[PDB]
């Protein structure tokens, strides 16, 4: 709800590079500063002989908004034999998928082609690059002697990637075995330690992987999408992965054990070609220490009020319970052909409400279909299906639409304010934007009239504008406020009070404030530090019965307040906001004796 969409950090890459196609953050433990990782898969690098090879750029967070290519590979194509190239990096889509963990960066080229040792070939084997400090290695999750379509030759390893707790990499290899697909995982240390620059196939000792299955599973694409988290009780994160055409195109998501590559859970879609498994994610959305399972089905057709099907997209949300089972609901999209279920990214506790929130996005929604990202808040009851905040793309299509929301990543408190920020990519316009999270203020407000019953003849207090005494009452209001993260101790508030609110609506005003001789009064509040309510006592008085004849309707005393958004903002303009679930007024009433 607090995402700042007025003053976001926008970055861009070279035209036609598909900058924004994939995003992540780079926050090393080795530095006090932050950089963003934004992919540019069809970038023109300086590598000899290579066209649109692709890259990932590091963008500085602290202004100076320039994005510098990561030199993962400064070289051209290696040869197999004299005048017979080994490999083909042109148009490989390097940077199609980028992920990080601590001080390390992983990025891959799923459409890297390779010549086999035995036969002249151009097979989409795929390849990844991994960096640790200055150490750079190539990782070939699917390059082995199993060099054909029924093996790993068409694997496209690196199509999808993710990092587990501890320090392990999960990679999707969707083309293995005539596209049954395959999950592969390896320790980071193994990938780097065993690297040998002139070996096409490197064996690793603790490598986990799925294996070839029966033909009934052909063309299922396992590894198309991945996510991680522990579901099998304790230990290392398990491997969550989507298979877009499992179960005869209904689609499925499988979760495999974190110690050995063996299935724990089996989730499935309801509708053919809805692509259940297209995208996956996991996080403890209800705050009960159990990662949940989020499954995208982007071209789900729901049934409308007219009895007909409508392509709107879906995300299935399954909550992990202590019993080992799951419970579940469904979030459908909002517009036709706006692929809502295509992108899922955990926000983390974006508003600091105690539960993680999540971003779900439709790359082709809205009039002027720039792409829409929906922010859904978490509760102990699971995800609130009703969005709280909607984030939208800002650039016109050139050819393909910006597809804002195509790629996303949150759960990272890049700014000082201890709320995770959000990167949303828009490759159709070669852009990416990092939206900061504003601090959220909770306000404890009070209002009380002590003379609960007003004696109209109790003419004991003076009325400042005259020589006469009037019946009057003490209207006190108070405010206290605090919040998390980085916010000033002093918060200005505008407070306005009304008397006899339900009669001032075109009728007699039976009570006025004594000093202003008016139904209204305002105050500049400067509530600060937290735990203390700042109070103000106003005195109101009754008007004479001769005209002010209504002695039955209660006099409504009303107070409302608003945060000074500017005199609350820090150095960078990250204004605090008030929480969306906190009311900003109080109603009280006085009776006539």
């Amino acid at each position: 709800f607090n995402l700042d969409v007025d003053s976001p950090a926008e970055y861009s890459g070279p035209e036609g590079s598909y900058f924004g196609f994939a995003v992540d953050f780079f926050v090393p433990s080795a530095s006090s500063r932050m950089f963003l990782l934004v992919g540019a898969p069809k970038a023109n690098t300086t590598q000899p002989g290579i066209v649109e090879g692709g890259q990932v750029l590091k963008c500085d967070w602290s202004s100076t908004r320039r994005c510098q290519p990561i030199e993962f590979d400064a070289t051209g194509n290696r040869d197999y034999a004299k005048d017979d190239p080994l490999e083909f990096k042109s148009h490989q889509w390097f940077g199609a998928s980028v992920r990080s963990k601590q001080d390390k960066i992983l990025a891959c080229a799923p459409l890297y082609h390779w010549r086999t040792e035995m036969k002249q070939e151009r097979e989409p084997v795929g390849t990844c690059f991994l960096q640790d400090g200055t150490k750079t290695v190539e990782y070939a999750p699917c390059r082995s002697q199993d060099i054909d379509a029924d093996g790993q030759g068409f694997c496209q390893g690196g199509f999808s990637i993710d990092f587990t707790k501890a320090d392990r990499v999960l990679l999707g290899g969707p083309g293995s075995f005539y596209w049954q697909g395959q999950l592969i995982s390896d320790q980071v240390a193994e990938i780097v330690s065993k690297y040998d620059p002139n070996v096409y196939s490197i064996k690793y000792n603790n490598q986990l992987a799925t294996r070839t299955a029966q033909a009934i599973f052909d063309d299922s694409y396992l590894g198309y999408s991945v996510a991680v988290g522990d579901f099998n009780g304790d230990g290392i994160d398990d491997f969550v992965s989507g298979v877009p055409r499992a179960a005869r195109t209904l689609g499925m998501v499988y979760i495999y054990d974190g110690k050995n590559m063996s299935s724990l859970y089996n989730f499935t879609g309801e509708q053919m070609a809805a692509y259940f498994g297209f995208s996956v994610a996991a996080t403890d959305i209800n705050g009960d220490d159990y990662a949940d399972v989020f499954i995208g089905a982007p071209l789900f057709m729901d049934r409308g009020s007219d009895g007909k099907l409508q392509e709107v997209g879906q995300v299935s949300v399954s909550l992990q319970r202590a019993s080992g089972d799951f419970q579940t609901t469904k979030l459908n999209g909002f517009e036709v052909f706006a692929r809502f279920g295509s992108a899922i990214a955990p926000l983390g506790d974006l508003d600091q409400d105690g539960f993680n929130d999540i971003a779900i996005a439709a790359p082709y929604g809205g009039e002027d279909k720039k792409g829409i990202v929906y922010i859904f808040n978490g509760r102990s009851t699971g995800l609130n299906a009703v969005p709280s905040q909607i984030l939208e793309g800002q650039w016109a299509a050139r050819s393909m639409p910006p597809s804002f929301g195509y790629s996303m990543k949150g759960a990272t408190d890049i700014d000082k304010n201890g709320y995770p920020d959000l990167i949303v990519g828009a490759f159709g316009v070669d852009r990416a934007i990092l939206y900061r999270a504003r601090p959220v203020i909770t306000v404890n407000a009070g209002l009380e009239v002590y003379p609960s019953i007003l004696n109209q003849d109790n003419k004991t207090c003076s009325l400042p504008g005259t020589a006469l005494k009037v019946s009057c009452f003490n209207v006190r209001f108070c405010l206290k406020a605090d919040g998390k993260g980085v916010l000033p101790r002093k918060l200005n508030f505008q407070v306005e009070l009304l008397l006899d609110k339900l009669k001032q609506k075109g009728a007699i005003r039976r009570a006025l404030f004594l000093y202003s001789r008016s139904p209204s009064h305002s105050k500049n509040m400067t509530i600060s530090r937290g735990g203390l309510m700042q109070c103000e006592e106003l005195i109101a008085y009754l008007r004479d019965e001769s005209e002010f004849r209504d002695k039955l309707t209660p006099i409504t005393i009303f107070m409302e307040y608003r945060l000074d958004y500017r005199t609350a903002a820090d150095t960078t303009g990250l204004q605090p906001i008030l929480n969306q679930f906190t009311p900003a007024n109080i109603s009280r009433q006085a009776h006539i004796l």
Epitope: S32, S62, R66, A74, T571
Partner: antibody
Framework: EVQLVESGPGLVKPSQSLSLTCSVT?????????WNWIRQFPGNELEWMGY???????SYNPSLKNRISITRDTSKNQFFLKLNSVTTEDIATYFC??????????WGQGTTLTVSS | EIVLTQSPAIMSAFPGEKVTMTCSAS?????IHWYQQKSGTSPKRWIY???KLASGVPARFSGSGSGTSYSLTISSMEAEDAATYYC?????????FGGGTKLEIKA
């Protein structure tokens, strides 16, 4: 490594235009990295003249605003700094540096530009 | 824009002594670079990313600072530490440099 040499400096007259280059060898640097330019007045601190990258735009410390322009060549790994309206306060050492990250290094080997009679 | 200032302009510091080089900003920077250049030769920088040894730099050089207040601490000095140090900031359109502070040799 980054090997840097500079156009031989000359002796110019007040308000004479002059082109001084940064010739970089060892690897391709025209689109792979961001470059800057430095002005060193001997006896004091370094100052800065400008920048250029794959993106041909610059910025300038607005003294002789828009009297200095930076050009990037392609196949030659050659950057050009063009000085218009040189003044006698521009007698300084000029060179290029290589970095995008807020830091700099790989500075040139010494230049002596003189504006005189 | 702002200009970083410095206080230890000239010091007759000796090998073995602890010495600090400093800077100060008129507005938040949240970053510093420590550049090294001898007037007659071709050495490279000391510290980058506020506090991180540049390639080839000995343990003696340790950076610090935040906000507007920055420094470089030189632990017990090396024979060649008697050099001129410069601060640098590129967080705005011009580059900003410190005026330069130096250590010298006399005995």
């Amino acid at each position: 490594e980054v090997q840097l040499v500079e156009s031989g400096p000359g002796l110019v007259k007040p308000s004479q235009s002059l082109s001084l280059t940064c010739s970089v060898t060892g690897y391709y640097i025209t689109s792979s990295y961001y470059w800057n330019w430095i002005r060193q007045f001997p006896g004091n601190e370094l100052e800065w003249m400008g920048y250029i990258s794959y993106d041909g735009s610059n910025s300038y410390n607005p003294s002789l605003k828009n009297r200095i322009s930076i050009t990037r060549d392609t196949s030659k790994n050659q950057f050009f700094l063009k000085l218009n309206s040189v003044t006698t306060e521009d007698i300084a050492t000029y060179f290029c540096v290589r970095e995008d990250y807020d830091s700099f290094d790989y500075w040139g080997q010494g230049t002596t530009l003189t504006v005189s009679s | 824009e702002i200009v970083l200032t410095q206080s230890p302009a000239i010091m007759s510091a000796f090998p073995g002594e602890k010495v600090t080089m400093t800077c100060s900003a008129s507005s938040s920077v949240s970053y510093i670079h420590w550049y090294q250049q001898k007037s007659g030769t071709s050495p490279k920088r000391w510290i980058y990313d506020t506090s991180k040894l540049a390639s080839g730099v000995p343990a003696r050089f340790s950076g610090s600072g935040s906000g507007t207040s920055y420094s470089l601490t030189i632990s017990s000095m090396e024979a060649e530490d008697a050099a001129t140090y410069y601060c640098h900031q590129w967080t705005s359109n011009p580059a900003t440099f410190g005026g330069g502070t130096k250590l010298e040799i006399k005995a």
